[PDB]
Amino acid sequence: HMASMKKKGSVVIVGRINLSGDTAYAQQTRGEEGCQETSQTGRDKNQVEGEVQIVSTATQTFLATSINGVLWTVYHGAGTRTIASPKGPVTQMYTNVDKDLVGWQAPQGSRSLTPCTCGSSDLYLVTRHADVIPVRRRGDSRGSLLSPRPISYLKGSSGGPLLCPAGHAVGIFRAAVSTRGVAKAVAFIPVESLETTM
Ligand SMILES: COc1ccc2nc(O[C@@H]3C[C@H]4C(=O)N[C@]5(C(=O)NS(=O)(=O)C6(C)CC6)C[C@H]5/C=C\CCCCC[C@H](NC(=O)OC(C)(C)C(F)(F)F)C(=O)N4C3)c(C(F)(F)F)nc2c1
Ligand SMILES: [Zn+2]
Numbered sequence: 001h002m003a004s005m006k007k008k009g010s011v012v013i014v015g016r017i018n019l020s021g022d023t024a025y026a027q028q029t030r031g032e033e034g035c036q037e038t039s040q041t042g043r044d045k046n047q048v049e050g051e052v053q054i055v056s057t058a059t060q061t062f063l064a065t066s067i068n069g070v071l072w073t074v075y076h077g078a079g080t081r082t083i084a085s086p087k088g089p090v091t092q093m094y095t096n097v098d099k100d101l102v103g104w105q106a107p108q109g110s111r112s113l114t115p116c117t118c119g120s121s122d123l124y125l126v127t128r129h130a131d132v133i134p135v136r137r138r139g140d141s142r143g144s145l146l147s148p149r150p151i152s153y154l155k156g157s158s159g160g161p162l163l164c165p166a167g168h169a170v171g172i173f174r175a176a177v178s179t180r181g182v183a184k185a186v187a188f189i190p191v192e193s194l195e196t197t198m
Contacts, residue, residue, distance in 0.1 A: 014031075052065050118164050
């Protein structure tokens with residue numbers, strides 16, 4: 001009934017992938033209890049840094065990537081949810097279920113990646129464990145892993161970036177191409193598709 005209808009919580013930033021130095025590593029910035037609390041209130045006072053955030057809902061955890069002032073992630077992770085911020089929940093500025101794509105204004109303090117114009121096919125996928133995985137581009141929205149690995153290692157990395165050799169954003173990781181549990185390839189949202197949405 002109407003009196004007892006629940007509201008879905010916000011997406012919450014719970015960590016980041018540190019790419020600022022010579023070593024990539026994951027950092028947690030909020031534990032599970034604080035994530036649950038922040039999800040209900042939508043008020044996140046933590047300072048945000050970097051380009052790739054680790055994000056969570058009550059039931060899922062995945063990634064989100066800032067490109068040209070927009071924090072982007074996958075619809076199959078975030079749905080239509082708001083994101084927690086220091087002033088309360090922030091409504092999505094982009095929602096496109098057909099591309100599995102959502103976006104919010106980039107959090108204050110984040111840093112954005114620049115959309116790639118290199119036209120290069122030698123890419124790098126960044127995972128939630130701060131693995132940097134070489135990927136050869138194979139089409140507009142597909143790339144092959146130079147070294148395949150079980151889908152377990154990629155789970156939780158949707159919304160993460162594929163980067164070019166110079167560190168520009170080439171796309172957003174969406175899905176794994178899996179055969180008997182091995183990821184030989186990945187599907188991603190090309191940055192051009194983000195640039196159109198903008
Ligand atoms: C109504 O709106 C909707 C609703 C639901 C939708 N569900 C969609 O796919 C779902 C979710 C997605 C996924 O697993 N994402 C990753 C991840 O890490 N997720 S996540 O962070 O853990 C988490 C789930 C957020 C927490 C990177 C993966 C890492 C490991 C793979 C595990 C094994 C799964 C293999 C699968 N493979 C596949 O379907 O490949 C196809 C597409 C057939 C191929 F590419 F081969 F053609 C695959 O990857 N996924 C199945 C898609 C789309 F398919 F677009 F993604 N749109 C939607 C639009
Ligand atoms: Zn580039």
